Design a protein around this ligand. Structure first.
Ligand SMILES: Cc1cc2nc3c(=O)[nH]c(=O)nc-3n(C[C@H](O)[C@H](O)[C@H](O)COP(=O)(O)O)c2cc1C
Ligand SMILES: Cc1cc2nc3c(=O)[nH]c(=O)nc-3n(C[C@H](O)[C@H](O)[C@H](O)COP(=O)(O)O)c2cc1C
Ligand SMILES: NC(=O)c1cc(N(CCCl)CCCl)c([N+](=O)[O-])cc1[N+](=O)[O-]
Ligand SMILES: NC(=O)c1cc(N(CCCl)CCCl)c([N+](=O)[O-])cc1[N+](=O)[O-]
Lengths: 217, 217
């Protein structure tokens, strides 16, 4: 139909044209994309840093050191740069915040309904932080789902981007003081327009055949 | 077709209409989306099981026989049900398949480039299994990214879907021989059309305000 073309044509830009900026509306749309992404129990265990100024992107680019210098240009030449972050721990106060927000949005017809939603999220949140002891990983997964949504989304807006795992999270967390605020940086995504130097823009996309990765029953 | 419109209008279907099946074109499109999703170093550490037959969907819904009974109707009433599986461990045979497929796809100009690509992927793959000891979680994250991409894609195709974490992965894994093949189920996503008995379709969307989850610099 339409998004299939977007999916088959989008790519990880290797070089950005620093002079091509997102339009005022697009800048707002990418923020909307970030927030409306789904998440288990609507937990939204994330926080985003959107860098659009030269100074802002420079602070983000501090994480592209060591063996990650190959990603410095991308972080500095893109119009906007999104740092996706996950909570370091699922706290009850935040869980309450999530339910109160759903209540204010008119999702609960009765107080019994709200209580039943708190319970549902509670069991899930408990299963991960008290029994499986993988709450940090559970929350990180939701941030990655968000990234997936975000990448196809910006591509559908006619925007170029690249997901980056090659950066120093310790350096980034310290630069923005995320540790104390209760967050950790996971993926950095510069968004804008590719430049003529983006050799990946003209290369064919490559994926494993479906006979290997897919099973139909 | 505005992508922001689909993001704001999409929702998690709580009940599907068994008579409304995907068209052959949509069934093909769904597989294209799963296959073309991006991933760290094009690792594609996943496997998908697509159940379109009533007997196939029945087997999947067996994982919701415990305290997840409420989720059983979703896996059976939906046209197609996709379970996203992550590799349990990153073997050198898989790293070989990916770089060979890329070579076959013409992404490498010379034999040295192919080598450098394989070196960069191994660098990242080694750091996760040898140093951080989190390859299982790193691969699970890629699978979640695929889910994010997927949910948006089907929504944009005009299809209803719902991501499900409420299922027993141990039962599902044993039902489809997983674990032996080197995979583990993570998310189940039934795709199709919602029925008039879907309350979430009329209900408003709820997300935390940007003043809490987003910071601009
Ligand atoms: C990874 C994941 C797991 C989910 N598991 C379930 C589930 O077991 N049952 C269900 O009804 N909804 C499930 N959901 C749906 C969420 O509650 C939903 O995404 C969230 O409330 C936001 O609503 P929306 O998807 O309509 O935007 C899941 C969502 C995600 C992302
Ligand atoms: C989570 C994640 C991390 C990535 N990290 C980097 C990175 O640090 N630098 C880079 O240039 N590409 C990076 N990529 C790009 C991938 O190699 C790319 O998604 C993959 O080769 C498939 O190509 P495509 O995105 O053009 O379809 C990353 C991709 C993902 C999904
Ligand atoms: N897996 C969860 O426990 C969960 C539970 C519920 N319900 C609430 C009562 Cl426990 C049960 C019927 Cl599904 C819903 N829900 O509302 O549809 C969604 C999720 N969810 O994950 O997002
Ligand atoms: N050959 C590729 O297209 C490729 C190139 C690069 N770089 C060049 C662009 Cl500036 C780094 C070398 Cl400095 C990166 N990357 O940023 O790491 C990843 C991939 N990749 O697919 O793996």
């Amino acid at each position: 139909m339409d998004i299939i073309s977007v999916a088959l044509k989008r790519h990880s830009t290797k070089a950005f044209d620093a002079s091509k900026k997102l339009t005022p509306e697009q800048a707002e749309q990418i923020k909307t994309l970030l927030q409306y992404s789904p998440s288990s129990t609507n937990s939204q265990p994330w926080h985003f840093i959107v860098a659009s100024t030269e100074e802002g992107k420079a602070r983000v680019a501090k994480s592209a050191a060591g063996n990650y210098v190959f990603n410095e240009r991308k972080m500095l030449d893109a119009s906007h740069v999104v740092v996706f972050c996950a909570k370091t721990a699922m706290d009850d106060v935040w869980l309450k915040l999530v339910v109160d927000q759903e209540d204010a949005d008119g999702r609960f017809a009765t107080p019994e309904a709200k209580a039943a939603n708190d319970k549902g999220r509670k069991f899930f949140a408990d299963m991960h932080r008290k029994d499986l002891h993988d709450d940090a990983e559970w929350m990180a997964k939701q941030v990655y789902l968000n990234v997936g949504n975000f990448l196809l989304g910006v591509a559908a807006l006619g925007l170029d981007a690249v997901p980056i795992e090659g950066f120093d999270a310790a350096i980034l967390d310290a630069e923005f003081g995320l540790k104390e605020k209760g967050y950790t940086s996971l993926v950095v995504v510069p968004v804008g327009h590719h430049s003529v130097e983006d050799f990946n823009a003209t290369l064919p996309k490559s994926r494993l055949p479906q006979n290997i990765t897919l099973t139909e029953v």
